[model samples]
Target: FASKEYGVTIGESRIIYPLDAAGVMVSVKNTQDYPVLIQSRIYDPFVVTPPLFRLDAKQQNSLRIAQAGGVFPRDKESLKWLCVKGIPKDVGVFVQFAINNCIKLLVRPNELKGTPIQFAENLSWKVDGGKLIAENPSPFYMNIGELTFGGKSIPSHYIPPKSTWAFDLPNVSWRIINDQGGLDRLYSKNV
Candidate 1:
């Protein structure tokens, strides 16, 4: 079986790691009939315990992550990634292939509960070396869902608090789509 079909599986697709909570818990299970090597890593803002291990057939494991000393915006939510890679031990010819799984790691601030839509609404953009510099003046982080230039969708990225996210922009009319904080909205303005 392919590793994705019978390899390691994590319980949640998103992890809400609060500052005051006792870390986050993730349950991993092996669905295959052979041994599997499971490897996990936390992208940032936290420390992962038991980063690597092996699981038996139909076995389960728990992964715990705790907040570390990494600096995060006080008035915004931070995002990280939990990457879990699994490989079957009996793969004689497919030793280089592994199943990679990634989950969202969202860290919420204590007091700032503002939405990313609010942040995106207050943003300003300017041309910078054939790229658009999206500036966020608000205290919240802007998770830009999509950006459209001349009716075509461009790639989107996150802009931190009082920071800028730069992306290549066509020299045409543009609109932005922000979908964070459970809110969905589109923004466009006449030049």
Candidate 2:
């Protein structure tokens, strides 16, 4: 079962970890009136504590993350998923449901300590006549809040680091996720 049937929720949609500190806490909560066997797993170079545990209904717990340092990128952010699964146990009467949640965990090093906006504005936006491309050669991810092309709004999206996205129209403008996790103003090459 997914979120609708899983009866579980994670407080943080995403986690940002300092590469040196090498640890972060994640909050998980059981929403249903029953107990669930919670299982957590993360990729190599990182580990989640209490990999297996039980969460009583209406109770919450924190998942401890242990980061294996010195192996990640020192220039860019390394993105990984922290997967948490709810293994349902039979309590009778109600249908047993299992939930699998994969949350994004972004690990950043101390080397790139500048404001995200400064790095965000580094994207190279080029016009290819009828086509527009945004090239993020920088190591920072551009979490797009809003996008506009040819004076019309496109949609909200995210552009991964060192990637490029092209639109069918020219004259592109965009807003990115700011340092405090808020949306910034729209920036256009013409402006």
Candidate 3:
């Protein structure tokens, strides 16, 4: 397909996976009147057929991404990020710069499916070394959107199944924002 937009846009915001075994298609567009180059790379557990390519002006290209079944757990949901970078061809030193965009990729077990909030609820938490620790007792993974503690925003994170996660924070009640945009409370206590 052809388009007048430059830069890369993920075809899907979140992949339903397995259902996406045919893989996810990434749309790379060259909006500039001049031709440009596009590159793609997927994080762990996910692989792209072509890591590099070129795009013509006003032209769009497709990239396919599939699970590589690496160390990343396949029995439960796993989280990953896909990065797409674009750079203008033969530009001056001052104009030589590349733009990159990243999106979240969710991989779920073949049989388990539910709201991300449910997975967050399955997390068990504790405190250690002024940090908030989270443990996932459920079979599914939790994709945490945002976490706040001590009136400050902590980085978003995820917990793997049957795994223990430790965060550094004073013993206090922390708030968790799930991928589904639900807010929940996480109380810190002795493990």
Candidate 4:
């Protein structure tokens, strides 16, 4: 079903894929008052079906995202960018701006030790010499929606699985971007 608001909307903030070399379908809707042209595209090792189409007002459709087998690691998470753009149908000689909706595509192994949220919550960390160091010991990438040091904001970013990242800032709490695209609870690292 179409959304009640205007413009195009994707059902999920991010896509999580359990690999079987399969494609995942995501719901897309156009809530514009006018018919729009929908275009989907992904690069390199991924493919998107029905890359282009015309959608009447308030119409909805599903887009398929397929991954190339052997293109990603099985033990760690892999990430891709998928862009779905929509433009209201316009007559010739008119300039129309298209809304580019970019989303993240995460691929996981068929089996994992724990949930992503739990893994992100248990990240190994320490504060030393005015620096905040965090480690992702799990095989899943951790998306940080917001992070703060002494309540001061830090740039949002991600930590790759099985890796360590050192930040110059110290004294902190943070939140992760969960599977639902919402922010998880803030984690207080009072180290």
Candidate 5:
């Protein structure tokens, strides 16, 4: 699980993802005294939570795969039911997202019964993606559990944007992983 807080003004937009089995709900409003045109995106990517870090193979194998944060629009910010895979077995995967020019990451580990991952957060979406990412390729690993975000648990919610100013585009695409060799297979379904 991963979450993000952003100081957005009227018309500013943000993206998010819910990478856990139980979905998350979001509430947003323009700080300014005007209606904002906020947009959101929902991508179904794999997510792995903590706890799995200590789980034995048998227990870890019992967990299921959960997708992280989803693209959110003002009309529907709750990503609770976004992407819940029906598989009963858990896999080693996670999701990331961009908010307020920063990227947030989350992961899962194993313990007993394959410790399911847990997450939460409470920080403004003000981060130095370039600097932090440059300093450490795995910012979430350096931050979550070990580090704190705004006094809240890390790996909670929010998925990173694929590119800068991504909302400006009219259409969004999807990606699927290949069962063989393990690679992302992207397709332009909207077009």
Candidate 6:
């Protein structure tokens, strides 16, 4: 139930939510050596308040990760297997190799900073607006307060580790949220 080798790798986790606003989650053992770390927090550009996030050996609720509904987990390091809510079906999600940083929307790979890592040019992308699918590869390392994604101007602050964050978008487009709450709209939005 603690950090495993090399800083407590997370096995596999899921986010169940939107049900009465409750997301059920689970974190398993990776090497059976280190227990995963799950931090629940209220973050800007995501949720209004910080909710209770728990990491148990194995947990099951009557609800699925998406429908149960709050911030949901998709990818993690040193682990495998996950079940999440359905709300993330339409959006794209990217989990930094390990750790807690996830791009629940669009991430410009070449534009990303911090520990450099390669993203799959052929990476698969799926959007159903029902099930959350994480196709983005993990970054080498995420330097605190230095990680950024966007072409120019302002950008949305990526969510911190071990926390669930959400953003409501109008459509499917590779756009950026500026520091002023304005849209950069990398690609045409109305298209």
Error of 2 at 1 (Å): 18
Query: Which lDDT value does model 3 have at 40?
Result: 75
Tens digits of per-residue lDDT for model 5 on 1-191?
Answer: 66433333211122233333363233332332322233333235543332122222122122233455544332121322211121118896655332231222222211112111111121112234321111211112212222222333223222222111111111122222221212233222211
Write the residue-wise lDDT of candidate 4 on 63-167 in tens digits.
888876456676788877788888669775634577889888888887777767887677767877777878888888898888888888878678888987777
Which regions of candidate 5 are displaced past 4 Å? 1-20, 46-105, 110-140, 144-191
| Candidate with maximal lDDT | 4
Which number leads on TM-score? Answer: 4
- State how far residue 138 of model 4 sits from its true place (Å): 1.6
Give model 1's clash tally: 0
Candidate 2 CA-lDDT value? 0.76
Query: Deviation in angstroms for 126 in model 2?
Result: 3.6
lDDT agreement with native, every candidate: 0.70, 0.76, 0.63, 0.80, 0.25, 0.28
Ten-residue stretch with the least lDDT total in model 6: 79-88
Question: How does residue 180 of candidate 5 score in lDDT?
Answer: 22
Model 3 spans with C-alpha error above 4 angstroms: 1-7, 29-34, 44-50, 56-59, 67-74, 89-95, 170-191
Order of candidate numbers by TM-score, starting with the best: 4, 2, 1, 3, 5, 6
Error of 5 at 128 (Å): 24
Pairing residues by index, what is the TM-score of model 2? 0.73
Model 4 vs truth, CA RMSD: 5.6
For candidate 6, lDDT tens digit of each residue in 1-191?
Answer: 33222222322322212223333333322232323334433222223111223333333222123222233343321111232211106996544334432222221223234321222121222434542122334431111122122222222333322232233221222333332233433332221
Separate clash counts for every candidate: 0, 0, 7, 0, 51, 26
Which 10 residues in a row give candidate 2 its minimum summed lDDT?
Answer: 1-10
Task: Answer with 3 or 5, whichever has the higher TM-score.
Answer: 3
